[PDB]
Design a protein around this ligand. Structure first.
Ligand SMILES: Nc1ncnc2c1ncn2[C@@H]1O[C@H](COP(=O)(O)O)[C@@H](O)[C@H]1O
Ligand SMILES: Nc1ncnc2c1ncn2[C@@H]1O[C@H](COP(=O)(O)O)[C@@H](O)[C@H]1O
Lengths: 245, 243
């Protein structure tokens, strides 16, 4: 068990009062991986750190670009050109200097997924946009019963009150999730069971897509909320599993 | 009237692709006030900045405290003891150096609300927690037809998906909103109309409250702020539309 220090309780006393003391230790002992530190994942990383999660792995090899500014928490003038994962790690150490943060400066691929998932995470939050690796990550977590939550496309959306969680097989107005389902079947033989489910939790929105005005655009209000609903769903699952034990 | 630089178009290309060029220009010309830079308002200030809003005022007098860490974007070790509004202003300038950020290092009170509120804001986001000033700010904006969105209670809640916007008269499960309508009536004679509405937009959640000083979580308090900002932008855009 990670030891909760007096400074930890000052930082996260509001966490303890919301979720209880048992959950505070559960979160301090957790190890959560965020794959893709972008429009969804950067805000997922922020939320985990601010809810007293004791260890966080960040996996991404992209750098902060000026064009990230609309929707990524790490996109500031002074960060531009630095590695997203490294920049987010430094911000997490500012939120909670006792959080153990690991940076994997790499992309997940069908060939390295086993080694990066081999670590035994409490939860994986998949926030990547490229469909091939996303399918491979999902296929691997599902087969190995690794707790995972994924996200459909967060672009082309303006209403954060329509964001919610469903089985991946049952999303709508999400072309990314549809391509994902195709690739899961075609490359990994992962298909719907009899009850019509893939057994994979997906954050999506019922909102009708807003097509490019002036690729799809995006807004913090929506993309960040994707990440926050992914974190809330993961924490809730973790707590349910602990109580069940 | 703000001339959108190319640097601005590089920052907010994605904004333009989502809301359109006309909206982008409307946001660059807007001036939005955020009152209370806490678990709700700090994320609202952030969303405002990252959506290309061209002028932002922040009103708060409190300092960043370690206990803020669970739910406020400016709560970081090196910021502790600095004025929240100034820390947030500095961050906004790092998001968009061309943004015009004004810090009011004061609390809104029933005696200074007209002086601060009547600067001609495009929109006011009220994210204050104290009931009496909050009633006063709502009553003033509503009497003066200042576009306002207010936020109810964000603490004691774990489910960001239950957050919504409705007329302040129709909120449920929110004691802060209930106390506000009471105070509005008693101290300002602000009361429901014919249609049952008070004519005030309120961000609230239908979730039943979790009693341990409620706790709070970023995933919820931030989403209150994000939903306030999306609502304000929708209303401004709809008003622009209808020329
Ligand atoms: N295979 C991958 N592994 C890890 N991160 C990825 C991978 N593919 C894409 N990403 C990242 O996922 C993030 C997607 O965010 P966005 O551009 O905001 O949708 C970006 O930061 C990408 O660099
Ligand atoms: N009358 C007021 N005028 C402006 N800001 C206020 C007022 N009362 C409270 N606040 C701020 O509202 C914020 C509430 O945040 P929280 O404590 O997270 O609800 C804090 O940063 C307070 O300092």
């Amino acid at each position: 068990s990670v030891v909760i220090s007096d400074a930890w309780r000052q930082r996260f006393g509001g966490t303890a009062r919301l979720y209880g003391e048992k959950a505070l230790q559960l979160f301090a002992d957790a190890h959560i991986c965020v794959v893709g530190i972008g429009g969804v994942g950067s805000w997922a990383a922020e939320a985990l750190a601010r809810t007293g999660i004791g260890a966080i792995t960040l996996i991404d090899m992209d750098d902060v670009c000026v064009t990230n500014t609309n929707r990524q928490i790490h996109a500031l003038r002074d960060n531009v050109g630095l590695a997203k994962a490294e920049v987010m790690a430094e911000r997490i150490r500012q939120i909670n200097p006792e959080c153990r943060v690991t940076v994997v400066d790499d992309f997940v691929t069908p060939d390295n997924v086993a080694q990066y998932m081999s670590v035994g995470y409490s939860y994986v939050i998949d926030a990547i946009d490229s469909v091939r690796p996303k399918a491979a990550l999902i296929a691997y977590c599902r087969r190995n019963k690794i707790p995972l939550v994924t996200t459909g496309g967060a672009g082309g959306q303006i209403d954060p009150t329509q964001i919610q969680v469903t089985d991946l097989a049952k999303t709508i107005q999400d072309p990314l999730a549809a391509k994902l389902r195709e690739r899961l079947k075609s490359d990994f033989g992962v298909v719907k069971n009899s009850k019509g489910k893939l057994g994979v939790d997906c954050v999506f929105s019922t909102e009708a897509l807003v097509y490019p005005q002036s690729g799809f655009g995006a807004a913090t209000m929506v993309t960040a909320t994707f990440g926050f609903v992914a974190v809330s769903h993961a924490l809730k699952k973790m707590m349910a599993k602990a109580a069940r034990q």
